[PDB]
Ligand SMILES: CC(C)(COP(=O)(O)OP(=O)(O)OC[C@H]1O[C@@H](n2cnc3c(N)ncnc32)[C@H](O)[C@@H]1OP(=O)(O)O)[C@@H](O)C(=O)NCCC(=O)NCCS
């Protein structure tokens with residue numbers, strides 16, 4: 001029997017989600033199980049759980065982000081630069097690898113989208129505009145990003161059947177950690193400014209591993225190691241949402257634990 005919207009709201013309430021909360025979900029729909037009206041059922045339950053004064057923030061990125069196509073170049077290669085589509089935030093599909101739920105979140109009426117094509121965030125609620133802008137190239141997940149403002153607003157990280165590697169907010173801890181040898185990457189993204197495509201090339205922290213030892217793809221990254229150490233030492237509300245076991249994490253607390261985790265293991 002498919003999970004109903006009211007059943008999920010009760011589960012989210014037991015987990016600790018309150019009206020007015022600012023929640024960042026990381027979801028595995030296969031772990032949730034069949035829903036009454038598909039993935040939209042979970043989206044409706046999330047929005048009812050946070051209430052009218054609450055907010056939902058999701059890292060949705062972009063299905064056609066030219067990350068690897070421009071990685072390590074001073075400029076987009078000629079073939080990429082001429083024909084690649086401009087990132088239209090209100091029309092660009094989410095990256096499917098980060099969760100099929102995000103395309104349902106992105107297309108919810110009233111949802112806002114940040115202008116960073118690769119690190120694009122989706123936000124629903126009264127603070128959606130403040131969350132999504134600004135989001136410049138070179139500030140993907142650190143200060144001045146939607147993650148930073150999410151951390152300054154008592155945000156809660158809701159992992160629904162997702163592994164510890166999914167804690168995207170921990171990339172802020174990597175960005176501000178005062179450690180030596182931090183990895184950086186250079187890529188180019190096509191922005192849509194006033195109907196005109198504008199290519200922007202920037203450098204930023206490597207979101208696939210802040211240090212070399214955490215960047216092997218086979219391959220637990222710094223996000224997974226920090227989250228597992230945190231979840232092993234911290235009392236976190238855990239319970240079912242649908243068929244998936246879930247956690248409601250204090251975003252500012254795990255990011256503070258992440259900065260201390262990195263700076264305790266690597267010199268300045
Ligand atoms: C990676 C991860 C998504 C994999 O878990 P998953 O359940 O296997 O993947 P999804 O959540 O996208 O669920 C996919 C299911 O929904 C289906 N689906 C996709 N789009 C659909 C749509 N429009 N309508 C109905 N069903 C759809 C998929 O087909 C699939 O179902 P199927 O296998 O029976 O065909 C999950 O483990 C996770 O970690 N999520 C958080 C990731 C994140 O936030 N990353 C940010 C960078 S760290």
Ligand SMILES: CN[C@@H]1[C@@H](O)[C@@H](O[C@@H]2[C@@H](O)[C@H](O[C@H]3OC(CN)=CC[C@H]3N)[C@@H](N)C[C@H]2N)OC[C@]1(C)O
Nearest residue numbers: 061062065067068095118165166207208209217221
């Ligand atoms: C859309 N373009 C994408 C580009 O944004 C970037 O995506 C990053 C992504 O891997 C990271 O998630 C994975 O990390 C690892 C191993 N490191 C294991 C599984 C995942 N948790 C996330 N933490 C940060 C993302 N920015 O690289 C790939 C890309 C497809 O090009």
